[PDB]
């Protein structure tokens, strides 16, 4: 029964700095090692730093050496993780788990990570609210593939997600499938909503996506035709 | 760099699935204690198996860890529904004076038919290329398991510029769906006769192309 | 033995999570840092000592004795020490709680018929409140009086609130009493007693305890250190001061190079086209790879080289054996003194540190001094040989030649390859070429 | 939270010094980081500041 | 326990260290005596040359 309290998820602009704090319950952190791992959103895991309470030893990733730094309050039973001059990309979830590599060992290797924390989520970005750009997407040529045709819209470079797209105020609820937006290297999301309407009406009924953005108060309706 | 791990693995309920994890000579000859961590969906990782089969308390014995030569693996028997999650083969190296992690794996308990990706590649809108910036909207939907390596390529080369792919998400039924956006300047859209969005899923490749 | 998350003491006492170690024997009890205790709060006076002696025995072999406590409840337990779902207590220990409305002055005895030393581990309870005292022990004034035919020990409970631990503001003082063969044990407590269920078969062995978290890989290695076993092929080492078994002396220097080969005067005159074949003096022959000392003839038949195994061998022999002679191949040591601490103890501690420290400095000196003596001595030895083989030739050649000085002998007469060979073994005779040589010299 | 120390006053006349036949026993208790200190005296206590 | 352990170590350590000196010293003396006597014999020979 060993708990781990992690500092409330924080957010700061790039170039600024944050510090994650880890608490321990039961076994004194003092007789246990520690390390931190970043969890980029659906990006896998990546070990960052390693400290050893009552051993004052520290080893960091060749990648972020200097930028990051360990700390330990042997008096309050809590460890610290310092990150200065943060980078837009670096934002992700951070954890702190026990390590056996203590005393004579020094080396982490042997020890198998145990008891990981709930995790703190820091967010690095310089972005501000933006208005979504609505652009129509129609078949480059009558699809005629399997059946009907696929026409939709494209909202690009907008913050902050998400904006509701409504085809003809909801007149078109059949076939519509809005794919999950994506974070651009720039820092602004982008999503798409396509519909599956009969190819025998590519000119009988028009389609309009009512992209209404609450963050930007930008209501942009677009027409989609081949 | 990152240990060599399989993109995904999947079997029927109550079967044996093996997750292959190979390492570099630095990790190989050292065979430094290799461990595996089970990361459930949307929850902090956990110690699945340690010290080369050293067992974590509370974890079903149906989990076993073997190691030999330049690689080691994790075997899972009597695969249950819960058993599906993200697995990472954690280990430690020397040549890099640090510890190495596994690329990742996505274990999914079958009981859901494999599905082929429905790719719909869209051309840049008129008002879009108007602002001197195009965008190729490739939408991959209707595929299971939800594992897909999307490769966007010019006619003669692989382009990793503007490669934004959103990891797959479950559909209302159970099929996965994601999107891969790859924008570029107009001069580049006219450059090649046609651009194609290639996507890999379970060894099969579905594709769509569009020209100016 | 890997006590994992368990201290040799928590194992002895019999802590729930360390019960797996009961009746355990060992050579070197390794104590991990991850260790911890999860039973009723206790404090062992002169703890270190007890721990030390236990490690010396090398066995937690418990031998339950049939104790009979009359008019008093037995097998007391509490939440702090839960063995499974239901509460519990120490294994080799027994909580003596009052029976009914009275706690008769308990008084028993136990003889040591056996010929081996017995080790009884008992303790006293320190009530956190008076009501707890008067309730759990009737009369508010408890008292324990363990005694043998040799020594006597009496403790008094100290009622009072103290730092809360595992949900308890009370404590238990641990006390051990060794009972020699033939002697007898006695216990006269009024209450607050924590009588043991038996004793431990104390043994006299190489058994000891070392602190470390080092991994345990399958292998054979005479030396063991908190940093992991190390080869004992060398005389000294700089890994750690704490050792076990046959290990090299722990000197301060992290390195000491010992001259094994000959002193080397590298580079060569390599004189021109025609080779003067000049004597060693200020140069070694990187060409000669068949020995340490050789000869080079420059007769009319041409040039040639041959190493004299005799001379070379003498040097090697002296060199090889010396090292092991000077330094003892090995020396064993088992239980020693703690060469480390985690808190301040004043006087006692100070001394211990001084002793060990003083040892190292003194020892280091010997190593440093010794190596210097050896290297310095080796050079003279090897360098001497080369000088003798040169004099061995002077006496042999006699008058026939002269010492050019460059380390060569300028033979004054036609000397074919056979003529040269006859001189290298030492068979060669001066009279043969005497007349001939004598002429070319003074004419 | 680690060790425990309990002392009992010893009433009795002793060598007179500076005009007093009484004495004061000095005891020190080290408190490591995180750990806590506690004092439960009935009397005759000489608490530190 | 503690007290005893130390006492033994001290004395034991002393002997081991002391022994070394004796062993080392004797090796030096014998090795040194030989050269000394052997040298004399060599000098009287050169004194004649
Ligand atoms: C075998 O295992 C042992 C033990 O695991 C290991 O020993 C450690 O060795 C490392 C490196 O060789 C040491 O780390 C260095 O420590 C420097 C000084 O700080 C440390 O040492 C202090 C004093 O050292 C002596 O300690 C006692 C005497 O006091 C003595 O027994 C020792 O032999 C040693 O000579 C020590 O006081 C201090 O810790 C105190 O304070 C903390 C505070 O909370 C307290 O908790 C402790 O209880 C203790 O009272 C501390 O441990 C340090 O300057 C040095 O820094 C390096 O990095 C910086 C950059 O970060 C560089 O600028 C610098 O040049 C150095 O490279 C480094 O951290 C370590 O002290 C030894 N002991 C420990 C803690 O394990 C052996 O190395 C292993 N064998 C090998 C060689 O593999
Ligand atoms: C608290 O709990 C303890 C538990 O031990 C309890 O017991 C005490 O133990 C001692 C010894 O351990 C007991 O003492 C014994 O007393 C008997 C009885 O003495 C009477 O009878 C003898 C004759 O039999 C008279 O001479 C005497 O005047 C008394 O009236 C002794 O007989 C015992 O000693 C001899 O007998 C032993 C038993 O066979 C032998 O083993 C021993 O060697 C003794 O032999 C003697 O004679 C030999 C002749 O050949 C001679 O060679 C020997 O040298 C030796 O002299 C023994 O002393 C006693 O019961 C307890 N002592 C106390 C405290 O009273 C405590 O009683 C209990 N506390 C209480 C009071 O509640
Ligand atoms: C310990 O083992 C010995 C045999 O070596 C046996 O006599 C004794 O009963 C055992 N103790 C326990 C735990 O019962
Ligand atoms: C010495 O050289 C002579 C050459 O005349 C040869 O006959 C003899 O065997 C040699 N002796 C040795 C010891 O090699």
XYZ file of N, CA, C and O in Angstrom, chain C residues 95-236:
568
model
N 2.830 -12.698 23.627
C 2.309 -11.603 24.434
C 1.573 -12.187 25.636
O 0.645 -12.981 25.479
N 1.992 -11.793 26.833
C 1.370 -12.284 28.055
C 0.389 -11.260 28.619
O 0.790 -10.293 29.266
N -0.896 -11.479 28.362
C -1.940 -10.583 28.843
C -2.601 -11.160 30.090
O -2.700 -12.377 30.241
N -3.055 -10.280 30.977
C -3.691 -10.705 32.218
C -4.854 -11.662 31.973
O -5.554 -11.564 30.964
N -5.049 -12.586 32.908
C -6.127 -13.565 32.824
C -7.236 -13.196 33.800
O -6.985 -13.002 34.990
N -8.461 -13.104 33.297
C -9.576 -12.751 34.154
C -9.369 -11.386 34.777
O -9.162 -10.401 34.069
N -9.415 -11.324 36.104
C -9.234 -10.062 36.812
C -7.905 -9.982 37.556
O -7.727 -9.120 38.415
N -6.967 -10.866 37.228
C -5.678 -10.862 37.913
C -4.470 -11.277 37.077
O -4.579 -12.072 36.141
N -3.315 -10.722 37.435
C -2.052 -11.020 36.767
C -1.091 -11.482 37.856
O -0.304 -10.693 38.380
N -1.154 -12.771 38.220
C -0.270 -13.303 39.258
C 1.186 -13.113 38.867
O 1.533 -13.209 37.689
N 2.035 -12.830 39.847
C 3.450 -12.647 39.564
C 3.940 -13.932 38.912
O 4.086 -14.956 39.579
N 4.170 -13.885 37.605
C 4.644 -15.059 36.887
C 6.079 -15.384 37.271
O 6.932 -14.499 37.329
N 6.333 -16.660 37.538
C 7.663 -17.115 37.914
C 7.876 -18.542 37.434
O 7.256 -19.479 37.936
N 8.753 -18.698 36.448
C 9.055 -20.007 35.890
C 10.564 -20.212 35.821
O 11.335 -19.379 36.299
N 10.976 -21.322 35.220
C 12.390 -21.643 35.089
C 12.632 -22.564 33.900
O 11.726 -23.270 33.456
N 13.858 -22.550 33.389
C 14.217 -23.391 32.255
C 15.710 -23.703 32.273
O 16.544 -22.816 32.085
N 16.064 -24.976 32.508
C 17.457 -25.428 32.557
C 18.056 -25.662 31.173
O 17.339 -25.966 30.219
N 19.372 -25.520 31.072
C 20.062 -25.731 29.808
C 20.854 -27.032 29.852
O 22.083 -27.025 29.942
N 20.136 -28.150 29.801
C 20.760 -29.468 29.827
C 21.691 -29.612 28.631
O 22.802 -30.128 28.751
N 21.221 -29.149 27.478
C 21.983 -29.214 26.238
C 23.378 -28.626 26.428
O 23.580 -27.732 27.250
N 24.337 -29.132 25.658
C 25.721 -28.680 25.747
C 26.056 -27.446 24.912
O 27.203 -27.001 24.893
N 25.062 -26.893 24.225
C 25.287 -25.706 23.406
C 24.642 -24.470 24.026
O 23.648 -24.572 24.745
N 25.218 -23.305 23.747
C 24.710 -22.048 24.286
C 23.323 -21.711 23.752
O 23.078 -21.762 22.547
N 22.417 -21.366 24.663
C 21.053 -21.009 24.294
C 20.881 -19.496 24.253
O 21.472 -18.772 25.054
N 20.068 -19.025 23.314
C 19.811 -17.598 23.171
C 18.322 -17.292 23.236
O 17.590 -17.505 22.269
N 17.880 -16.791 24.385
C 16.479 -16.448 24.580
C 16.247 -14.969 24.304
O 16.889 -14.106 24.903
N 15.324 -14.682 23.391
C 15.004 -13.306 23.033
C 13.658 -12.913 23.632
O 12.616 -13.441 23.242
N 13.687 -11.985 24.582
C 12.472 -11.519 25.239
C 12.298 -10.016 25.073
O 13.006 -9.381 24.291
N 11.350 -9.451 25.814
C 11.106 -8.025 25.729
C 10.150 -7.514 26.789
O 9.531 -8.293 27.513
N 10.038 -6.193 26.880
C 9.151 -5.556 27.846
C 8.244 -4.583 27.102
O 8.661 -3.963 26.125
N 7.004 -4.453 27.563
C 6.047 -3.556 26.924
C 5.967 -2.220 27.654
O 5.940 -2.172 28.884
N 5.925 -1.137 26.885
C 5.840 0.207 27.444
C 4.475 0.829 27.163
O 4.282 1.493 26.145
N 3.507 0.618 28.071
C 2.152 1.156 27.928
C 2.153 2.647 27.616
O 2.956 3.405 28.159
N 1.249 3.064 26.736
C 1.145 4.465 26.359
C 0.278 5.234 27.349
O 0.359 6.460 27.436
N -0.545 4.509 28.101
C -1.426 5.124 29.089
C -1.532 4.257 30.343
O -1.192 3.075 30.320
N -2.005 4.853 31.433
C -2.163 4.134 32.693
C -3.294 3.117 32.600
O -3.170 1.994 33.090
N -4.397 3.516 31.974
C -5.540 2.627 31.813
C -5.143 1.403 30.994
O -5.584 0.292 31.276
N -4.308 1.616 29.982
C -3.835 0.524 29.136
C -2.991 -0.418 29.987
O -3.048 -1.638 29.839
N -2.206 0.174 30.880
C -1.333 -0.562 31.788
C -2.152 -1.378 32.784
O -2.041 -2.602 32.839
N -2.973 -0.687 33.565
C -3.808 -1.332 34.572
C -4.790 -2.331 33.968
O -5.204 -3.282 34.630
N -5.159 -2.112 32.709
C -6.094 -2.994 32.019
C -5.407 -4.238 31.471
O -5.813 -5.364 31.762
N -4.368 -4.026 30.673
C -3.623 -5.125 30.069
C -2.700 -5.839 31.053
O -2.310 -6.981 30.820
N -2.361 -5.175 32.155
C -1.450 -5.763 33.135
C -1.891 -5.699 34.588
O -1.088 -5.948 35.487
N -3.154 -5.368 34.829
C -3.649 -5.287 36.196
C -2.844 -4.227 36.951
O -2.849 -3.061 36.561
N -2.147 -4.622 38.017
C -1.354 -3.670 38.795
C -0.661 -2.692 37.847
O -0.005 -3.102 36.890
N -0.809 -1.401 38.125
C -0.232 -0.348 37.294
C 1.290 -0.347 37.169
O 1.832 0.260 36.247
N 1.983 -1.014 38.085
C 3.441 -1.045 38.028
C 3.983 -2.387 37.549
O 4.097 -3.335 38.326
N 4.319 -2.457 36.264
C 4.854 -3.684 35.705
C 6.311 -3.867 36.079
O 6.926 -2.967 36.653
N 6.870 -5.029 35.753
C 8.263 -5.318 36.068
C 8.703 -6.672 35.522
O 8.012 -7.674 35.694
N 9.856 -6.689 34.861
C 10.407 -7.917 34.299
C 11.766 -8.176 34.936
O 12.558 -7.250 35.119
N 12.040 -9.433 35.272
C 13.307 -9.774 35.903
C 13.923 -11.070 35.383
O 13.873 -12.103 36.050
N 14.498 -11.013 34.186
C 15.144 -12.184 33.606
C 16.492 -12.333 34.295
O 17.181 -11.344 34.541
N 16.870 -13.566 34.612
C 18.137 -13.796 35.287
C 18.661 -15.214 35.123
O 17.894 -16.175 35.049
N 19.983 -15.328 35.061
C 20.642 -16.616 34.920
C 21.533 -16.823 36.136
O 21.663 -15.933 36.977
N 22.149 -17.993 36.225
C 23.016 -18.304 37.350
C 24.282 -17.449 37.309
O 25.056 -17.422 38.267
N 24.480 -16.741 36.199
C 25.647 -15.880 36.037
C 25.303 -14.397 36.152
O 25.762 -13.717 37.071
N 24.500 -13.897 35.217
C 24.115 -12.490 35.224
C 22.669 -12.281 35.661
O 21.924 -13.236 35.877
N 22.287 -11.013 35.788
C 20.938 -10.635 36.194
C 20.497 -9.392 35.428
O 21.271 -8.449 35.263
N 19.250 -9.393 34.969
C 18.713 -8.264 34.219
C 17.279 -7.963 34.642
O 16.424 -8.848 34.633
N 17.022 -6.714 35.012
C 15.689 -6.302 35.432
C 15.292 -4.997 34.752
O 16.028 -4.011 34.804
N 14.124 -4.999 34.118
C 13.631 -3.818 33.422
C 12.299 -3.353 34.000
O 11.535 -4.150 34.546
N 12.030 -2.057 33.879
C 10.790 -1.479 34.382
C 10.064 -0.753 33.252
O 10.656 0.067 32.548
N 8.767 -1.044 33.065
C 7.978 -0.403 32.008
C 7.898 1.109 32.184
O 7.824 1.610 33.307
N 7.914 1.832 31.070
C 7.849 3.287 31.104
C 6.572 3.803 30.451
O 6.534 4.048 29.245
N 5.528 3.966 31.258
C 4.246 4.454 30.764
C 4.375 5.892 30.273
O 4.989 6.731 30.931
N 3.790 6.166 29.112
C 3.851 7.502 28.549
C 3.572 7.495 27.059
O 3.905 6.535 26.365
N 2.961 8.565 26.565
C 2.640 8.667 25.148
C 3.911 8.960 24.355
O 4.787 9.692 24.818
N 4.006 8.385 23.161
C 5.174 8.571 22.309
C 4.795 8.584 20.826
O 3.661 8.261 20.471
N 5.738 8.963 19.942
C 5.477 9.014 18.500
C 4.604 7.874 17.988
O 4.917 6.699 18.183
N 3.507 8.235 17.330
C 2.574 7.255 16.790
C 3.178 6.504 15.609
O 3.714 7.110 14.682
N 3.084 5.179 15.655
C 3.614 4.326 14.598
C 2.657 3.174 14.310
O 2.146 2.536 15.231
N 2.418 2.915 13.028
C 1.515 1.847 12.605
C 0.221 1.824 13.408
O -0.416 0.780 13.546
N -0.160 2.982 13.936
C -1.385 3.079 14.707
C -1.243 2.779 16.187
O -2.213 2.387 16.836
N -0.044 2.965 16.728
C 0.198 2.703 18.142
C 1.137 3.709 18.794
O 2.165 4.080 18.226
N 0.769 4.144 19.994
C 1.564 5.103 20.751
C 2.331 4.366 21.843
O 2.788 4.969 22.815
N 2.468 3.054 21.673
C 3.172 2.217 22.635
C 4.411 1.602 21.988
O 4.609 1.722 20.780
N 5.238 0.945 22.795
C 6.456 0.315 22.292
C 6.794 -0.976 23.033
O 6.175 -1.310 24.043
N 7.789 -1.691 22.516
C 8.247 -2.946 23.105
C 9.772 -2.983 23.093
O 10.388 -2.979 22.028
N 10.379 -3.019 24.275
C 11.834 -3.063 24.376
C 12.340 -4.496 24.254
O 11.881 -5.389 24.964
N 13.290 -4.707 23.347
C 13.860 -6.031 23.126
C 15.122 -6.251 23.950
O 16.019 -5.407 23.975
N 15.183 -7.394 24.624
C 16.330 -7.749 25.448
C 16.667 -9.221 25.238
O 15.778 -10.073 25.227
N 17.951 -9.514 25.069
C 18.404 -10.880 24.850
C 19.262 -11.366 26.013
O 20.022 -10.597 26.600
N 19.132 -12.648 26.343
C 19.895 -13.236 27.437
C 20.433 -14.607 27.043
O 19.669 -15.549 26.840
N 21.755 -14.709 26.938
C 22.402 -15.962 26.568
C 22.553 -16.870 27.785
O 22.951 -16.422 28.860
N 22.231 -18.148 27.608
C 22.328 -19.119 28.691
C 23.359 -20.194 28.359
O 23.130 -21.036 27.490
N 24.494 -20.160 29.052
C 25.555 -21.135 28.823
C 25.181 -22.538 29.287
O 24.286 -22.714 30.114
N 25.870 -23.560 28.751
C 25.635 -24.967 29.090
C 25.664 -25.231 30.592
O 26.528 -24.720 31.305
N 24.714 -26.031 31.065
C 24.651 -26.350 32.479
C 23.937 -25.284 33.286
O 23.229 -25.592 34.245
N 24.122 -24.026 32.899
C 23.490 -22.910 33.592
C 21.980 -22.980 33.382
O 21.501 -23.724 32.525
N 21.230 -22.209 34.164
C 19.775 -22.205 34.056
C 19.208 -20.794 33.908
O 19.798 -19.822 34.381
N 18.059 -20.696 33.248
C 17.390 -19.417 33.032
C 16.192 -19.265 33.964
O 15.571 -20.252 34.360
N 15.874 -18.021 34.310
C 14.748 -17.726 35.188
C 14.078 -16.416 34.787
O 14.739 -15.479 34.339
N 12.760 -16.361 34.950
C 11.991 -15.174 34.600
C 10.983 -14.859 35.703
O 10.071 -15.645 35.961
N 11.152 -13.712 36.352
C 10.251 -13.302 37.423
C 9.685 -11.916 37.130
O 10.186 -10.910 37.634
N 8.636 -11.874 36.315
C 7.999 -10.617 35.942
C 6.658 -10.411 36.638
O 5.914 -11.363 36.872
N 6.358 -9.157 36.962
C 5.105 -8.807 37.616
C 4.084 -8.483 36.532
O 2.875 -8.533 36.760
N 4.589 -8.157 35.346
C 3.728 -7.826 34.227
C 4.506 -7.121 33.132
O 5.722 -6.961 33.236
N 3.809 -6.701 32.080
C 4.448 -6.006 30.968
C 5.541 -6.882 30.364
O 6.442 -6.391 29.683
N 5.451 -8.183 30.618
C 6.426 -9.142 30.114
C 6.089 -9.647 28.717
O 4.921 -9.744 28.340
N 7.131 -9.966 27.955
C 6.982 -10.484 26.601
C 7.848 -11.737 26.509
O 8.882 -11.747 25.839
N 7.419 -12.789 27.197
C 8.146 -14.051 27.227
C 8.282 -14.712 25.859
O 7.361 -14.673 25.042
N 9.448 -15.324 25.593
C 9.726 -16.007 24.326
C 9.154 -17.422 24.331
O 8.831 -17.963 25.390
N 9.034 -18.020 23.151
C 8.499 -19.372 23.040
C 9.613 -20.413 23.086
O 9.351 -21.609 23.202
N 10.858 -19.950 22.997
C 11.990 -20.858 23.029
C 13.323 -20.140 22.940
O 13.472 -19.029 23.449
N 14.295 -20.774 22.288
C 15.624 -20.190 22.137
C 16.188 -20.435 20.741
O 15.526 -21.017 19.882
N 17.423 -19.989 20.528
C 18.101 -20.167 19.250
C 19.429 -20.879 19.476
O 20.182 -20.532 20.386
N 19.712 -21.877 18.646
C 20.948 -22.641 18.766
C 22.135 -21.843 18.235
O 22.489 -21.941 17.059
N 22.744 -21.056 19.115
C 23.890 -20.229 18.758
C 25.071 -21.083 18.312
O 25.412 -22.073 18.961
N 25.695 -20.695 17.204
C 26.842 -21.422 16.674
C 28.029 -20.481 16.484
O 27.862 -19.264 16.410
N 29.225 -21.056 16.408
C 30.441 -20.276 16.219
C 30.967 -20.524 14.809
O 31.665 -21.508 14.565
N 30.631 -19.631 13.885
C 31.078 -19.800 12.515
C 31.533 -18.536 11.813
O 31.541 -17.448 12.388
N 31.910 -18.698 10.549
C 32.382 -17.602 9.712
C 31.218 -16.711 9.291
O 31.393 -15.758 8.533
N 30.028 -17.034 9.788
C 28.822 -16.283 9.463
C 28.889 -14.816 9.873
O 29.306 -14.484 10.982
N 28.470 -13.944 8.961
C 28.465 -12.504 9.198
C 27.401 -11.840 8.329
O 26.767 -12.496 7.503
N 27.209 -10.538 8.519
C 26.220 -9.790 7.751
C 26.839 -8.566 7.081
O 27.653 -7.862 7.679
N 26.445 -8.320 5.836
C 26.948 -7.182 5.076
C 25.771 -6.414 4.483
O 24.793 -7.015 4.038
N 25.864 -5.088 4.477
C 24.797 -4.257 3.930
C 25.020 -3.959 2.451
O 26.090 -3.496 2.057
N 24.002 -4.227 1.637
C 24.082 -3.990 0.198
C 22.797 -4.390 -0.525
O 22.024 -5.213 -0.033
N 22.582 -3.799 -1.696
C 21.405 -4.081 -2.514
C 21.837 -4.757 -3.811
O 21.019 -5.005 -4.698
N 23.129 -5.055 -3.908
C 23.704 -5.686 -5.091
C 22.967 -6.941 -5.546
O 22.529 -7.749 -4.727
N 22.828 -7.120 -6.869
C 22.144 -8.287 -7.433
C 22.898 -9.569 -7.100
O 24.092 -9.535 -6.802
N 22.199 -10.697 -7.150
C 22.810 -11.984 -6.840
C 22.787 -12.904 -8.054
O 21.808 -13.617 -8.281
N 23.862 -12.888 -8.831
C 23.956 -13.734 -10.013
C 24.663 -15.034 -9.660
O 25.537 -15.058 -8.794
N 24.281 -16.114 -10.331
C 24.891 -17.408 -10.074
C 26.336 -17.424 -10.556
O 26.607 -17.252 -11.744
N 27.260 -17.633 -9.623
C 28.685 -17.663 -9.941
C 29.518 -17.988 -8.704
O 29.027 -17.922 -7.576
N 30.783 -18.332 -8.924
C 31.698 -18.645 -7.835
C 32.750 -17.547 -7.712
O 33.436 -17.222 -8.681
N 32.868 -16.977 -6.518
C 33.835 -15.917 -6.264
C 34.136 -15.832 -4.772
O 33.263 -15.494 -3.971
N 35.375 -16.141 -4.407
C 35.799 -16.113 -3.011
C 35.580 -14.776 -2.313
O 35.252 -14.744 -1.126
N 35.765 -13.673 -3.031
C 35.575 -12.366 -2.410
C 34.200 -11.761 -2.673
O 33.652 -11.873 -3.771
N 33.653 -11.120 -1.645
C 32.345 -10.479 -1.721
C 32.420 -9.065 -1.153
O 32.987 -8.847 -0.082
N 31.846 -8.108 -1.875
C 31.850 -6.717 -1.439
C 30.472 -6.104 -1.657
O 29.680 -6.605 -2.456
N 30.164 -5.008 -0.943
C 28.865 -4.347 -1.090
C 28.625 -3.902 -2.532
O 27.520 -3.499 -2.894
N 29.671 -3.980 -3.348
C 29.586 -3.593 -4.751
C 29.502 -4.824 -5.641
O 29.448 -4.715 -6.866
N 29.493 -5.994 -5.015
C 29.428 -7.231 -5.767
C 30.774 -7.925 -5.757
O 31.817 -7.271 -5.764
N 30.747 -9.253 -5.739
C 31.963 -10.058 -5.723
C 33.021 -9.504 -6.674
O 32.694 -8.940 -7.718
N 34.288 -9.662 -6.302
C 35.391 -9.190 -7.131
C 36.517 -10.221 -7.125
O 36.706 -10.940 -6.143
N 37.283 -10.304 -8.223
C 38.389 -11.261 -8.308
C 39.490 -10.943 -7.300
O 39.838 -9.780 -7.094
N 40.033 -11.983 -6.673
C 41.088 -11.813 -5.681
C 42.449 -12.244 -6.218
O 43.243 -12.858 -5.505
N 42.714 -11.918 -7.479
C 43.980 -12.267 -8.110
C 45.049 -11.245 -7.744
O 46.238 -11.564 -7.689
N 44.616 -10.014 -7.490
C 45.523 -8.933 -7.129
C 45.720 -8.863 -5.617
O 44.927 -9.412 -4.853
N 46.788 -8.184 -5.166
C 47.088 -8.046 -3.739
C 46.169 -7.073 -3.002
O 45.767 -7.329 -1.866
N 45.840 -5.960 -3.650
C 44.980 -4.950 -3.042
C 43.782 -4.638 -3.933
O 43.639 -5.201 -5.019
